[PDB]
Each structure stands twice: as C-alpha cells, then as structure tokens.
Amino acid sequence: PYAVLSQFYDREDWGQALRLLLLLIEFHYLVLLVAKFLYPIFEDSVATVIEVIETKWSNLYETIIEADKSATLLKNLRKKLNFKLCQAFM
C-alpha cells in the first residue's frame, strides 16, 4: 500500500521499486508483476537488485503475463540488459 501511494505521488519511485524488489526477495506471480512494473518505468543498488531478481528467476503466472501484455523471460532479460546499459551510461 505504501509503495502504491509512493507511485501515485523520481527518488520516491526508486525507493518504491527497491521496496518491491525486497518484498520479492522475501517471498512467481509477484516476480512477474515486479518485472512488468520495471518495464513500465523503463544506481548501483538498483543494478544489484535487478541482478538478484535475475538469479531468482506456472500457468497462473503465464496467464497474468498474458493479461499484462494485453516470451516473458526474454522480455525480462531485455529489460535487464537495458538497465545495465543505462547504468553504464551514467
């Protein structure tokens, strides 16, 4: 709820994303939702988080992914690559 509130309200957005990654680490569907959120948004700490997520990475999850789009792993990898590129540019 706090994360959603922060989202509704740049640094705040980053803090929310960090909180989300932390929650995902503590916990498949959740991970997918997180990836979707990251893609929509599209430094060192952020990269570390993205990495941990990649390391962590069924039918219900696929359905959720399909609903969001309206392959997933590939899109996730692409997003991660983009983030890495952004970090390198910074």
Binding site: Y2, R19, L22, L23
Partner: peptide, 8 residues
Amino acid sequence: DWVEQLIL
C-alpha cells in the same frame, strides 16, 4: 514502524 516491518 511500517517501513521497519517491510524491511523485515
């Protein structure tokens, strides 16, 4: 408090 329980 709420943000300390989320970090845990």
